[PDB]
Protein backbone atom coordinates (compact mmCIF):
# COMPACT_ATOMS: atom_id res chain seq x y z
CA UNK A 1 0.00 0.00 0.00
CA UNK A 2 2.75 2.49 0.85
CA UNK A 3 4.59 1.52 -2.34
CA UNK A 4 1.54 2.20 -4.50
CA UNK A 5 0.61 5.43 -2.69
CA UNK A 6 4.10 6.86 -3.18
CA UNK A 7 3.88 5.64 -6.78
CA UNK A 8 0.83 7.88 -7.19
CA UNK A 9 2.78 10.57 -5.32
CA UNK A 10 5.58 10.56 -7.88
CA UNK A 11 3.29 10.11 -10.89
CA UNK A 12 0.82 12.85 -9.96
CA UNK A 13 3.50 15.31 -8.82
CA UNK A 14 5.45 14.89 -12.06
CA UNK A 15 2.32 15.16 -14.20
CA UNK A 16 0.99 18.20 -12.34
CA UNK A 17 4.35 19.98 -12.49
CA UNK A 18 4.67 19.32 -16.22
CA UNK A 19 1.04 20.20 -17.00
CA UNK A 20 0.83 23.38 -14.90
CA UNK A 21 4.24 24.62 -16.06
CA UNK A 22 3.33 23.97 -19.70
CA UNK A 23 -0.04 25.68 -19.19
CA UNK A 24 1.42 28.81 -17.59
CA UNK A 25 4.23 29.09 -20.13
CA UNK A 26 1.70 28.42 -22.91
CA UNK A 27 -0.37 31.35 -21.70
CA UNK A 28 2.90 33.29 -21.73
CA UNK A 29 3.27 32.20 -25.36
CA UNK A 30 -0.38 33.17 -25.84
CA UNK A 31 0.43 36.72 -24.79
CA UNK A 32 3.61 36.69 -26.89
CA UNK A 33 1.85 35.57 -30.08
CA UNK A 34 -0.94 38.07 -29.41
CA UNK A 35 1.78 40.72 -29.22
CA UNK A 36 3.33 39.60 -32.51
CA UNK A 37 -0.14 39.63 -34.09
CA UNK A 38 -0.69 43.19 -32.90
CA UNK A 39 2.73 44.19 -34.28
CA UNK A 40 1.52 42.81 -37.61
CA UNK A 41 -1.59 44.91 -37.01
CA UNK A 42 0.53 48.06 -36.70
CA UNK A 43 2.49 46.95 -39.78
CA UNK A 44 -0.74 46.88 -41.78
CA UNK A 45 -1.65 50.16 -40.06
CA UNK A 46 1.53 51.86 -41.30
CA UNK A 47 1.01 50.40 -44.78
CA UNK A 48 -2.43 52.00 -44.72
CA UNK A 49 -0.80 55.15 -43.32
CA UNK B 1 17.41 4.76 -14.09
CA UNK B 2 20.66 6.30 -12.85
CA UNK B 3 20.22 8.77 -15.69
CA UNK B 4 16.52 8.97 -14.80
CA UNK B 5 17.33 10.35 -11.36
CA UNK B 6 19.42 13.02 -13.14
CA UNK B 7 16.45 14.61 -14.96
CA UNK B 8 13.77 16.56 -13.07
CA UNK B 9 12.30 20.04 -13.08
CA UNK B 10 13.56 20.70 -16.61
CA UNK B 11 11.96 20.98 -20.04
CA UNK B 12 13.20 21.14 -23.66
CA UNK B 13 14.45 24.27 -25.39
CA UNK B 14 11.05 25.46 -26.65
CA UNK B 15 9.73 26.75 -23.33
CA UNK B 16 12.99 28.47 -22.34
CA UNK B 17 13.16 30.15 -25.75
CA UNK B 18 9.55 31.31 -25.41
CA UNK B 19 10.21 32.69 -21.92
CA UNK B 20 13.33 34.55 -23.07
CA UNK B 21 11.21 35.96 -25.89
CA UNK B 22 8.59 37.03 -23.34
CA UNK B 23 10.65 38.86 -20.72
CA UNK B 24 12.15 41.35 -23.19
CA UNK B 25 9.93 42.40 -26.09
CA UNK B 26 12.80 43.03 -28.51
CA UNK B 27 13.77 39.32 -28.27
CA UNK B 28 17.27 40.28 -29.50
CA UNK B 29 18.80 38.57 -26.45
CA UNK B 30 20.45 41.76 -25.20
CA UNK B 31 20.23 40.76 -21.54
CA UNK B 32 22.27 43.53 -19.91
CA UNK B 33 24.52 42.40 -17.06
CA UNK B 34 22.84 44.74 -14.57
CA UNK B 35 19.45 43.77 -16.00
CA UNK B 36 20.42 40.09 -15.93
CA UNK B 37 21.49 40.16 -12.29
CA UNK B 38 18.45 42.23 -11.29
CA UNK B 39 16.06 39.82 -13.02
CA UNK B 40 17.84 36.71 -11.71
CA UNK B 41 19.29 37.17 -8.21
CA UNK B 42 16.88 39.68 -6.68
CA UNK B 43 13.27 38.49 -6.95
CA UNK B 44 11.80 34.98 -6.87
CA UNK B 45 13.47 32.26 -4.82
CA UNK B 46 16.25 34.05 -2.93
CA UNK B 47 19.73 32.73 -3.72
CA UNK B 48 23.22 34.16 -3.58
CA UNK B 49 24.73 36.22 -6.38
CA UNK B 50 28.07 34.59 -5.53
CA UNK B 51 26.74 31.20 -6.65
CA UNK B 52 24.96 33.01 -9.50
CA UNK B 53 28.45 34.07 -10.65
CA UNK B 54 29.00 30.53 -11.93
CA UNK B 55 26.79 31.67 -14.81
CA UNK B 56 29.38 34.42 -15.41
CA UNK B 57 32.82 32.86 -14.93
CA UNK B 58 31.88 29.84 -17.09
CA UNK B 59 29.01 30.66 -19.45
CA UNK B 60 30.10 32.94 -22.32
CA UNK B 61 28.49 36.35 -21.81
CA UNK B 62 28.31 38.81 -24.69
CA UNK B 63 30.27 42.04 -24.46
CA UNK B 64 29.14 45.54 -23.36
CA UNK B 65 26.92 43.96 -20.70
CA UNK B 66 24.22 42.33 -22.81
CA UNK B 67 24.00 38.53 -22.63
CA UNK B 68 22.89 36.39 -25.57
CA UNK B 69 20.49 33.53 -24.89
CA UNK B 70 20.20 31.40 -28.04
CA UNK B 71 23.74 30.09 -27.61
CA UNK B 72 23.02 29.87 -23.88
CA UNK B 73 19.89 27.80 -24.53
CA UNK B 74 21.81 25.56 -26.94
CA UNK B 75 24.60 24.91 -24.43
CA UNK B 76 22.03 24.31 -21.67
CA UNK B 77 20.50 21.67 -23.93
CA UNK B 78 22.51 19.10 -25.90
CA UNK B 79 22.60 21.31 -29.00
CA UNK B 80 25.92 23.01 -28.25
CA UNK B 81 28.97 22.53 -26.04
CA UNK B 82 31.58 25.06 -24.96
CA UNK B 83 34.55 22.82 -25.86
CA UNK B 84 35.50 19.32 -26.98
CA UNK B 85 37.86 16.68 -25.62
CA UNK C 1 -17.70 84.62 -28.21
CA UNK C 2 -21.28 83.97 -27.08
CA UNK C 3 -20.89 80.19 -27.31
CA UNK C 4 -17.42 80.47 -25.77
CA UNK C 5 -18.93 82.69 -23.06
CA UNK C 6 -21.42 79.95 -22.17
CA UNK C 7 -18.81 77.19 -22.35
CA UNK C 8 -16.43 79.17 -20.11
CA UNK C 9 -18.67 80.89 -17.54
CA UNK C 10 -22.12 79.28 -17.27
CA UNK C 11 -20.36 76.03 -16.37
CA UNK C 12 -19.74 77.68 -12.99
CA UNK C 13 -23.33 78.70 -12.13
CA UNK C 14 -25.95 77.19 -14.45
CA UNK C 15 -28.27 75.54 -11.93
CA UNK C 16 -31.04 77.63 -10.31
CA UNK C 17 -31.44 79.41 -13.67
CA UNK C 18 -33.91 78.26 -16.36
CA UNK C 19 -32.15 76.63 -19.29
CA UNK C 20 -32.78 74.79 -22.55
CA UNK C 21 -34.29 77.64 -24.55
CA UNK C 22 -31.88 79.49 -26.85
CA UNK C 23 -31.86 83.19 -27.71
CA UNK C 24 -29.03 85.48 -28.78
CA UNK C 25 -29.37 88.49 -26.48
CA UNK C 26 -31.81 87.03 -23.95
CA UNK C 27 -29.54 84.18 -22.83
CA UNK C 28 -26.68 86.65 -22.42
CA UNK C 29 -28.90 88.87 -20.25
CA UNK C 30 -29.88 85.89 -18.10
CA UNK C 31 -26.22 84.93 -17.70
CA UNK C 32 -25.35 88.54 -16.81
CA UNK C 33 -28.02 88.71 -14.12
CA UNK C 34 -26.73 85.33 -12.91
CA UNK C 35 -23.33 87.00 -12.53
CA UNK C 36 -24.86 90.33 -11.35
CA UNK C 37 -21.65 92.12 -12.30
CA UNK C 38 -21.10 95.75 -13.25
CA UNK C 39 -22.49 96.96 -16.59
CA UNK C 40 -19.52 99.36 -16.47
CA UNK C 41 -17.10 96.42 -16.86
CA UNK C 42 -18.34 95.48 -20.35
CA UNK C 43 -20.46 96.58 -23.30
CA UNK C 44 -23.24 94.53 -24.90
CA UNK C 45 -23.18 93.57 -28.57
CA UNK C 46 -24.72 91.42 -31.27
CA UNK C 47 -21.82 88.99 -31.84
CA UNK C 48 -19.26 89.30 -29.03
CA UNK C 49 -19.14 91.05 -25.65
CA UNK C 50 -16.01 93.11 -24.99
CA UNK C 51 -14.82 93.19 -21.37
CA UNK C 52 -11.97 94.93 -19.57
CA UNK C 53 -8.69 93.55 -18.27
CA UNK C 54 -9.62 92.53 -14.73
CA UNK C 55 -12.78 90.47 -15.29
CA UNK C 56 -10.92 87.22 -16.02
CA UNK C 57 -8.84 87.53 -12.83
CA UNK C 58 -11.70 86.45 -10.54
CA UNK C 59 -13.63 83.76 -12.44
CA UNK C 60 -11.18 81.02 -13.44
CA UNK C 61 -10.24 80.01 -9.89
CA UNK C 62 -13.89 79.23 -9.10
CA UNK C 63 -13.65 76.33 -11.54
CA UNK C 64 -10.50 75.21 -9.72
CA UNK C 65 -12.34 75.40 -6.40
CA UNK C 66 -15.41 73.51 -7.59
CA UNK C 67 -14.05 70.76 -9.89
CA UNK C 68 -11.49 69.80 -7.23
CA UNK C 69 -13.51 67.05 -5.55
CA UNK C 70 -14.54 65.51 -8.88
CA UNK C 71 -11.00 65.46 -10.26
CA UNK C 72 -9.65 64.04 -6.98
CA UNK C 73 -12.17 61.19 -7.09
CA UNK C 74 -11.62 60.48 -10.79
CA UNK C 75 -7.84 60.41 -10.50
CA UNK C 76 -8.19 58.17 -7.44
CA UNK C 77 -10.16 55.69 -9.56
CA UNK C 78 -7.57 55.95 -12.35
CA UNK C 79 -4.69 55.34 -9.93
CA UNK C 80 -6.50 52.33 -8.49
CA UNK C 81 -7.08 50.84 -11.94
CA UNK C 82 -3.45 51.41 -12.95
CA UNK C 83 -2.21 49.84 -9.71
CA UNK C 84 -4.40 46.76 -10.18
CA UNK C 85 -3.35 46.24 -13.80
CA UNK C 86 0.38 46.75 -13.27
CA UNK C 87 0.42 44.72 -10.05
CA UNK C 88 -1.37 41.74 -11.60
CA UNK C 89 0.75 41.69 -14.76
CA UNK C 90 3.92 42.11 -12.75
CA UNK C 91 3.16 39.41 -10.26
CA UNK C 92 2.10 36.82 -12.84
CA UNK C 93 5.19 37.50 -14.97
CA UNK C 94 7.58 37.32 -12.02
CA UNK C 95 6.00 34.11 -10.72
CA UNK C 96 6.14 32.30 -14.06
CA UNK C 97 9.57 33.52 -15.19
CA UNK C 98 11.48 33.44 -11.93
CA UNK C 99 10.05 30.20 -10.54
CA UNK C 100 10.44 28.16 -13.73
CA UNK C 101 13.74 29.60 -14.91
CA UNK C 102 15.51 29.60 -11.55
CA UNK C 103 14.38 25.99 -11.06
CA UNK C 104 15.81 25.01 -14.45
CA UNK C 105 19.00 27.02 -13.91
CA UNK C 106 19.61 25.46 -10.49
CA UNK C 107 18.98 21.97 -11.85
CA UNK C 108 21.45 22.45 -14.70
CA UNK C 109 24.13 24.26 -12.67
CA UNK C 110 24.17 21.66 -9.89
CA UNK C 111 24.36 18.94 -12.56
CA UNK C 112 26.77 20.94 -14.74
CA UNK C 113 29.54 19.04 -12.92
CA UNK C 114 27.63 16.69 -10.59
CA UNK C 115 27.77 14.13 -13.43
CA UNK C 116 30.10 16.00 -15.78
CA UNK C 117 31.74 12.90 -17.26
CA UNK C 118 28.47 11.17 -18.13
CA UNK C 119 27.30 14.46 -19.63
CA UNK C 120 30.50 14.42 -21.72
CA UNK C 121 29.89 10.98 -23.20
CA UNK C 122 26.92 12.57 -25.04
CA UNK C 123 29.12 12.98 -28.12
CA UNK C 124 27.64 9.99 -30.06
CA UNK C 125 24.13 11.38 -29.49
CA UNK C 126 24.60 13.78 -32.41
CA UNK C 127 25.88 10.93 -34.58
CA UNK C 128 22.94 8.66 -33.73
CA UNK C 129 20.25 11.37 -34.06
CA UNK C 130 21.31 12.22 -37.62
CA UNK C 131 18.79 9.93 -39.35
CA UNK C 132 15.77 11.32 -37.50
CA UNK C 133 17.04 14.89 -37.83
CA UNK C 134 17.60 14.47 -41.58
CA UNK C 135 14.15 12.94 -42.10
CA UNK C 136 12.49 15.76 -40.16
CA UNK C 137 14.44 18.52 -41.91
CA UNK C 138 13.51 16.87 -45.21
CA UNK C 139 9.86 17.14 -44.19
CA UNK C 140 10.03 20.84 -43.30
CA UNK C 141 12.06 21.75 -46.40
CA UNK C 142 9.44 19.91 -48.45
CA UNK C 143 6.73 22.09 -46.90
CA UNK C 144 8.86 25.22 -47.44
CA UNK C 145 9.36 24.38 -51.12
CA UNK D 1 -19.54 96.66 -1.94
CA UNK D 2 -19.41 93.09 -3.24
CA UNK D 3 -17.09 92.40 -0.31
CA UNK D 4 -19.91 93.79 1.85
CA UNK D 5 -22.44 91.37 0.36
CA UNK D 6 -19.79 88.70 0.92
CA UNK D 7 -19.67 90.01 4.50
CA UNK D 8 -23.35 89.46 5.18
CA UNK D 9 -23.49 86.04 3.54
CA UNK D 10 -20.24 85.27 5.38
CA UNK D 11 -21.91 86.17 8.68
CA UNK D 12 -24.71 83.71 7.92
CA UNK D 13 -21.97 81.21 7.06
CA UNK D 14 -20.35 82.10 10.41
CA UNK D 15 -23.49 81.07 12.26
CA UNK D 16 -24.14 77.92 10.23
CA UNK D 17 -20.49 76.85 10.32
CA UNK D 18 -20.32 77.31 14.09
CA UNK D 19 -23.37 75.05 14.36
CA UNK D 20 -22.00 72.40 12.00
CA UNK D 21 -18.52 72.46 13.58
CA UNK D 22 -20.08 71.96 17.01
CA UNK D 23 -21.97 69.03 15.47
CA UNK D 24 -18.70 67.57 14.13
CA UNK D 25 -17.12 67.91 17.57
CA UNK D 26 -20.13 66.21 19.18
CA UNK D 27 -20.23 63.29 16.74
CA UNK D 28 -16.47 62.73 16.88
CA UNK D 29 -16.60 62.79 20.68
CA UNK D 30 -19.34 60.15 20.55
CA UNK D 31 -17.19 58.11 18.15
CA UNK D 32 -14.10 58.40 20.36
CA UNK D 33 -16.20 57.37 23.37
CA UNK D 34 -17.82 54.30 21.80
CA UNK D 35 -14.41 53.28 20.46
CA UNK D 36 -12.92 53.64 23.94
CA UNK D 37 -15.54 51.36 25.49
CA UNK D 38 -15.07 48.92 22.59
CA UNK D 39 -11.33 48.52 23.13
CA UNK D 40 -11.72 48.49 26.93
CA UNK D 41 -14.18 45.59 26.85
CA UNK D 42 -12.15 43.76 24.19
CA UNK D 43 -8.89 44.06 26.12
CA UNK D 44 -10.56 43.13 29.43
CA UNK D 45 -12.07 39.93 28.04
CA UNK D 46 -8.83 39.16 26.19
CA UNK D 47 -6.69 39.51 29.33
CA UNK D 48 -9.14 37.46 31.41
CA UNK E 1 -12.51 40.14 9.92
CA UNK E 2 -13.18 37.52 7.24
CA UNK E 3 -11.79 33.99 7.29
CA UNK E 4 -8.08 33.25 6.91
CA UNK E 5 -8.40 33.61 3.11
CA UNK E 6 -7.76 37.37 3.28
CA UNK E 7 -4.89 36.76 5.70
CA UNK E 8 -3.48 34.31 3.15
CA UNK E 9 -3.84 36.93 0.41
CA UNK E 10 -1.99 39.47 2.57
CA UNK E 11 0.70 36.86 3.30
CA UNK E 12 1.23 36.06 -0.38
CA UNK E 13 1.41 39.79 -1.12
CA UNK E 14 3.91 40.06 1.75
CA UNK E 15 6.14 37.43 0.14
CA UNK E 16 5.38 39.13 -3.19
CA UNK E 17 6.67 42.51 -1.95
CA UNK E 18 9.81 40.98 -0.44
CA UNK E 19 12.41 43.19 -2.14
CA UNK E 20 15.13 44.57 0.15
CA UNK E 21 14.07 42.11 2.84
CA UNK E 22 10.74 40.31 3.04
CA UNK E 23 10.13 41.24 6.68
CA UNK E 24 10.14 45.03 6.48
CA UNK E 25 7.35 46.77 4.55
CA UNK E 26 7.62 50.23 3.04
CA UNK E 27 4.54 52.41 3.42
CA UNK E 28 4.76 53.04 -0.32
CA UNK E 29 4.73 49.27 -0.90
CA UNK E 30 1.84 48.62 1.48
CA UNK E 31 -0.12 51.54 0.04
CA UNK E 32 0.35 50.23 -3.50
CA UNK E 33 -0.66 46.68 -2.60
CA UNK E 34 -3.67 47.74 -0.52
CA UNK E 35 -4.86 50.03 -3.30
CA UNK E 36 -4.55 47.30 -5.93
CA UNK E 37 -6.27 44.77 -3.66
CA UNK E 38 -9.60 46.53 -4.15
CA UNK E 39 -9.39 49.80 -2.21
CA UNK E 40 -9.54 52.94 -4.36
CA UNK E 41 -9.22 55.60 -1.59
CA UNK E 42 -5.50 56.26 -1.16
CA UNK E 43 -4.96 60.00 -1.73
CA UNK E 44 -5.20 61.60 1.73
CA UNK E 45 -4.95 58.45 3.86
CA UNK E 46 -1.25 58.97 4.65
CA UNK E 47 -2.14 61.25 7.57
CA UNK E 48 -5.04 58.99 8.58
CA UNK E 49 -2.65 56.02 8.70
CA UNK E 50 0.73 57.21 9.95
CA UNK E 51 -0.52 59.88 12.32
CA UNK E 52 2.66 61.76 11.35
CA UNK E 53 3.16 63.78 8.13
CA UNK E 54 6.83 62.67 8.23
CA UNK E 55 7.63 61.62 4.65
CA UNK E 56 11.36 62.37 4.51
CA UNK E 57 13.06 58.95 4.83
CA UNK E 58 12.28 56.65 1.91
CA UNK E 59 14.66 53.90 3.06
CA UNK E 60 13.16 53.31 6.54
CA UNK E 61 9.43 53.98 6.89
CA UNK E 62 8.64 51.41 9.55
CA UNK E 63 5.67 49.06 9.12
CA UNK E 64 5.13 45.42 10.10
CA UNK E 65 2.66 42.78 8.94
CA UNK E 66 1.21 42.45 12.45
CA UNK E 67 -0.23 45.96 12.77
CA UNK E 68 -0.79 45.92 9.00
CA UNK E 69 -3.98 43.87 9.40
CA UNK E 70 -6.05 46.35 11.49
CA UNK E 71 -4.82 49.07 9.15
CA UNK E 72 -6.53 47.28 6.27
CA UNK E 73 -9.77 47.08 8.26
CA UNK E 74 -9.78 50.75 9.29
CA UNK E 75 -9.20 51.59 5.63
CA UNK E 76 -11.76 49.10 4.27
CA UNK E 77 -14.54 50.61 6.39
CA UNK E 78 -15.04 52.56 3.13
CA UNK E 79 -14.77 56.14 4.33
CA UNK E 80 -15.83 57.40 0.88
CA UNK E 81 -17.82 55.85 -1.97
CA UNK E 82 -18.59 57.92 -5.06
CA UNK E 83 -20.55 56.88 -8.13
CA UNK E 84 -20.28 57.78 -11.79
CA UNK E 85 -23.11 60.36 -11.87
CA UNK E 86 -20.88 63.00 -10.27
CA UNK E 87 -17.95 61.98 -12.48
CA UNK E 88 -19.86 62.15 -15.78
CA UNK E 89 -21.47 65.49 -14.89
CA UNK E 90 -18.06 66.96 -14.07
CA UNK E 91 -16.67 65.75 -17.39
CA UNK E 92 -19.68 66.96 -19.38
CA UNK E 93 -19.19 70.35 -17.74
CA UNK E 94 -15.55 69.96 -18.79
CA UNK E 95 -16.84 68.86 -22.21
CA UNK E 96 -17.20 71.44 -24.98
CA UNK E 97 -19.66 70.22 -27.65
CA UNK E 98 -21.36 67.31 -25.86
CA UNK E 99 -19.69 64.58 -27.93
CA UNK E 100 -15.93 64.82 -27.30
CA UNK E 101 -14.50 65.83 -30.67
CA UNK E 102 -10.87 66.29 -29.60
CA UNK E 103 -10.38 65.80 -25.85
CA UNK E 104 -6.67 64.93 -25.80
CA UNK E 105 -5.18 68.35 -25.05
CA UNK E 106 -7.65 69.63 -22.46
CA UNK E 107 -7.58 66.49 -20.31
CA UNK E 108 -3.80 66.84 -20.10
CA UNK E 109 -4.24 70.52 -19.24
CA UNK E 110 -6.76 69.82 -16.47
CA UNK E 111 -4.55 67.10 -14.99
CA UNK E 112 -1.48 69.37 -15.04
CA UNK E 113 -3.39 72.24 -13.40
CA UNK E 114 -3.93 70.16 -10.25
CA UNK E 115 -1.36 70.69 -7.52
CA UNK E 116 -1.35 67.11 -6.20
CA UNK E 117 0.10 65.39 -9.25
CA UNK E 118 2.79 62.74 -9.45
CA UNK E 119 3.29 61.17 -12.88
CA UNK E 120 3.49 61.96 -16.59
CA UNK E 121 4.29 58.52 -18.02
CA UNK E 122 0.84 57.44 -16.85
CA UNK E 123 -0.53 60.54 -18.60
CA UNK E 124 0.95 59.30 -21.87
CA UNK E 125 0.01 55.71 -20.95
CA UNK E 126 -3.73 56.39 -20.64
CA UNK E 127 -4.00 56.23 -24.46
CA UNK E 128 -4.16 52.45 -24.04
CA UNK E 129 -7.57 50.95 -23.35
CA UNK E 130 -9.92 52.30 -26.03
CA UNK E 131 -8.57 55.82 -25.44
CA UNK E 132 -6.76 55.66 -28.77
CA UNK E 133 -8.23 58.31 -31.09
CA UNK E 134 -8.15 62.10 -30.63
CA UNK E 135 -10.35 62.02 -27.54
CA UNK E 136 -13.06 60.12 -29.41
CA UNK E 137 -14.74 58.91 -26.22
CA UNK E 138 -17.57 60.88 -24.63
CA UNK E 139 -16.04 59.53 -21.36
CA UNK E 140 -18.66 56.78 -20.86
CA UNK E 141 -16.41 54.01 -22.20
CA UNK E 142 -13.42 55.14 -20.15
CA UNK E 143 -15.53 55.50 -16.99
CA UNK E 144 -16.84 51.97 -17.55
CA UNK E 145 -13.30 50.67 -18.11
CA UNK E 146 -11.84 52.34 -15.01
CA UNK E 147 -14.82 51.19 -12.91
CA UNK E 148 -14.00 47.53 -13.58
CA UNK E 149 -11.21 46.83 -11.09
CA UNK F 1 -13.82 99.86 9.97
CA UNK F 2 -15.81 97.09 8.28
CA UNK F 3 -12.49 95.25 7.86
CA UNK F 4 -12.03 95.51 11.62
CA UNK F 5 -15.47 93.91 11.80
CA UNK F 6 -14.01 91.24 9.49
CA UNK F 7 -11.27 90.86 12.10
CA UNK F 8 -14.00 90.22 14.67
CA UNK F 9 -15.28 87.56 12.27
CA UNK F 10 -11.70 86.24 12.32
CA UNK F 11 -11.93 86.06 16.10
CA UNK F 12 -14.91 83.83 15.40
CA UNK F 13 -12.53 81.98 13.06
CA UNK F 14 -10.40 81.50 16.18
CA UNK F 15 -13.49 80.13 17.95
CA UNK F 16 -14.14 77.60 15.21
CA UNK F 17 -10.44 76.72 15.39
CA UNK F 18 -10.96 75.98 19.08
CA UNK F 19 -13.71 73.62 17.92
CA UNK F 20 -11.19 72.15 15.46
CA UNK F 21 -8.87 71.72 18.46
CA UNK F 22 -11.64 69.64 20.01
CA UNK F 23 -11.60 67.57 16.82
CA UNK F 24 -7.81 67.38 17.26
CA UNK F 25 -8.28 65.91 20.74
CA UNK F 26 -10.62 63.43 19.06
CA UNK F 27 -7.76 62.74 16.63
CA UNK F 28 -5.37 61.77 19.42
CA UNK F 29 -8.11 59.67 21.02
CA UNK F 30 -8.75 57.77 17.79
CA UNK F 31 -5.00 57.34 17.24
CA UNK F 32 -4.75 55.79 20.71
CA UNK F 33 -7.66 53.50 19.84
CA UNK F 34 -5.86 52.59 16.60
CA UNK F 35 -2.66 51.66 18.45
CA UNK F 36 -4.69 49.65 20.96
CA UNK F 37 -6.31 47.85 18.01
CA UNK F 38 -2.84 46.97 16.73
CA UNK F 39 -2.05 45.59 20.19
CA UNK F 40 -5.34 43.68 20.09
CA UNK F 41 -4.38 42.16 16.72
CA UNK F 42 -1.06 40.93 18.09
CA UNK F 43 -2.92 39.68 21.16
CA UNK F 44 -5.44 37.79 19.00
CA UNK F 45 -2.61 36.16 17.07
CA UNK F 46 -1.28 35.02 20.44
CA UNK F 47 -4.75 33.70 21.31
CA UNK F 48 -4.86 31.71 18.06
CA UNK G 1 -0.50 4.43 11.65
CA UNK G 2 -3.24 2.53 9.80
CA UNK G 3 -5.66 5.44 10.09
CA UNK G 4 -2.77 7.87 9.55
CA UNK G 5 -2.10 6.41 6.10
CA UNK G 6 -5.86 6.18 5.50
CA UNK G 7 -6.10 9.95 6.04
CA UNK G 8 -3.04 10.50 3.85
CA UNK G 9 -4.66 8.36 1.13
CA UNK G 10 -7.81 10.49 1.32
CA UNK G 11 -5.65 13.60 0.92
CA UNK G 12 -3.96 11.98 -2.08
CA UNK G 13 -7.38 11.27 -3.57
CA UNK G 14 -8.32 14.94 -3.11
CA UNK G 15 -5.18 16.11 -4.88
CA UNK G 16 -6.04 13.51 -7.54
CA UNK G 17 -9.31 15.30 -8.31
CA UNK G 18 -7.16 18.43 -8.28
CA UNK G 19 -5.12 16.73 -11.02
CA UNK G 20 -8.21 16.08 -13.15
CA UNK G 21 -9.14 19.73 -12.54
CA UNK G 22 -5.74 20.65 -13.98
CA UNK G 23 -6.50 18.40 -16.95
CA UNK G 24 -9.83 20.18 -17.47
CA UNK G 25 -7.93 23.46 -17.43
CA UNK G 26 -5.67 21.94 -20.10
CA UNK G 27 -8.65 21.38 -22.40
CA UNK G 28 -10.09 24.82 -21.71
CA UNK G 29 -6.69 26.39 -22.51
CA UNK G 30 -6.37 24.49 -25.79
CA UNK G 31 -9.88 25.42 -26.90
CA UNK G 32 -9.06 29.02 -25.94
CA UNK G 33 -5.98 28.92 -28.18
CA UNK G 34 -8.03 27.73 -31.15
CA UNK G 35 -10.76 30.27 -30.31
CA UNK G 36 -8.33 33.18 -30.42
CA UNK G 37 -6.97 31.66 -33.63
CA UNK G 38 -10.27 32.26 -35.38
CA UNK G 39 -10.56 35.62 -33.62
CA UNK G 40 -7.25 36.62 -35.25
CA UNK G 41 -8.51 35.29 -38.59
CA UNK G 42 -11.64 37.43 -38.29
CA UNK G 43 -9.51 40.42 -37.26
CA UNK G 44 -7.26 40.15 -40.32
CA UNK G 45 -10.35 39.78 -42.51
CA UNK G 46 -11.61 42.99 -40.88
CA UNK G 47 -8.41 44.85 -41.75
CA UNK G 48 -8.63 43.51 -45.31
CA UNK G 49 -12.19 44.84 -45.52
Swiss-Prot record, chain B:
GO molecular function: calcium ion binding; myosin heavy chain binding; myosin II binding; structural constituent of muscle
Key word Repeat present: yes
All copies of domain EF-hand, residue ranges: 11-46, 47-82
Full protein name: Myosin regulatory light chain 2, smooth muscle major isoform
Keyword Metal-binding: yes
Residues represented out of the complete protein: 88 to 172 of 172
A GO cellular-component term linked to this record: myosin II complex
Note: This chain binds calcium.
Superkingdom of this protein's organism: Eukaryota
GO terms, biological process: myofibril assembly
Subunit comment: Myosin is a hexamer of 2 heavy chains and 4 light chains.
The protein's role, per its UniProt record: Myosin regulatory subunit that plays an important role in regulation of both smooth muscle and nonmuscle cell contractile activity. Implicated in cytokinesis, receptor capping, and cell locomotion.
Keywords in alphabetical order: Acetylation, Calcium, Metal-binding, Motor protein, Muscle protein, Myosin, Repeat
Organism listed in the record: Gallus gallus
From Swiss-Prot, chains D, F:
Protein origin, superkingdom: Eukaryota
Compartment(s): Cytoplasm, Myofibril
Domain remark text: The rodlike tail sequence is highly repetitive, showing cycles of a 28-residue repeat pattern composed of 4 heptapeptides, characteristic for alpha-helical coiled coils. Limited proteolysis of myosin heavy chain produces 1 light meromyosin (LMM) and 1 heavy meromyosin (HMM). HMM can be further cleaved into 2 globular subfragments (S1) and 1 rod-shaped subfragment (S2).
Subunit structure as annotated in this protein's UniProt entry: Muscle myosin is a hexameric protein that consists of 2 heavy chain subunits (MHC), 2 alkali light chain subunits (MLC) and 2 regulatory light chain subunits (MLC-2).
Similarity section: Belongs to the TRAFAC class myosin-kinesin ATPase superfamily. Myosin family.
Cited function: Muscle contraction.
Name of this chain's protein: Myosin-11
Species for this entry: Gallus gallus (Chicken)
Gene: MYH11
Span within the parent record: 1450 to 1497 of 1979
Swiss-Prot record, chain E:
Lineage: Eukaryota, Metazoa, Chordata, Craniata, Vertebrata
GO terms under biological process: actomyosin structure organization; myofibril assembly
Entry keywords, A to Z: Acetylation, Motor protein, Muscle protein, Myosin, Repeat
Annotated GO MF terms: ADP binding; calcium ion binding; magnesium ion binding; microfilament motor activity; myosin heavy chain binding; myosin II binding; structural constituent of muscle
Position of the signal peptide: none
SUPFAM superfamilies: EF-hand
Alphabetical list of PROSITE patterns matching this protein: EF_HAND_2 (PS50222)
Stated role: Regulatory light chain of myosin. Does not bind calcium.
GO CC terms, sorted: actomyosin; cytosol; muscle myosin complex; myosin II complex; myosin II filament
Database matches in InterPro entries: CALM/Myosin/TropC-like, EF-hand-dom_pair, EF_hand_dom
Record-given protein name: Myosin light polypeptide 6
Domain annotation EF-hand: ranges: 5-40, 82-117, 117-149
Membrane-spanning ranges: none
Gene3D superfamilies given in the database record: EF-hand (1.10.238.10)
Subunit annotation: Myosin is a hexamer of 2 heavy chains and 4 light chains.
Highest taxon of the lineage: Eukaryota
Amino acid sequence: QVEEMKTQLEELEDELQAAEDAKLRLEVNMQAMKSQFERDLQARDEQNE
Amino acid sequence: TMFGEKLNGTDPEDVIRNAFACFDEEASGFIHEDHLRELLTTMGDRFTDEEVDEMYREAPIDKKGNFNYVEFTRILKHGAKDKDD
Amino acid sequence: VFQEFRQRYEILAANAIPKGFMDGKQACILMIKALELDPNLYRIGQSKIFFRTGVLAHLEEERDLKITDVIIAFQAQCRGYLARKAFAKRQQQLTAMKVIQRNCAAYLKLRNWQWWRLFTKVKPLLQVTRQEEEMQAKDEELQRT
Amino acid sequence: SNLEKKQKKFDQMLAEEKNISSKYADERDRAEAEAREKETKALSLARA
Amino acid sequence: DFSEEQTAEFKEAFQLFDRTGDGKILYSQCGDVMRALGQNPTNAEVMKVLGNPKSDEMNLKTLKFEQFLPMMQTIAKNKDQGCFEDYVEGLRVFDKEGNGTVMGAEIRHVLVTLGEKMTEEEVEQLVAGHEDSNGCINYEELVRMVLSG
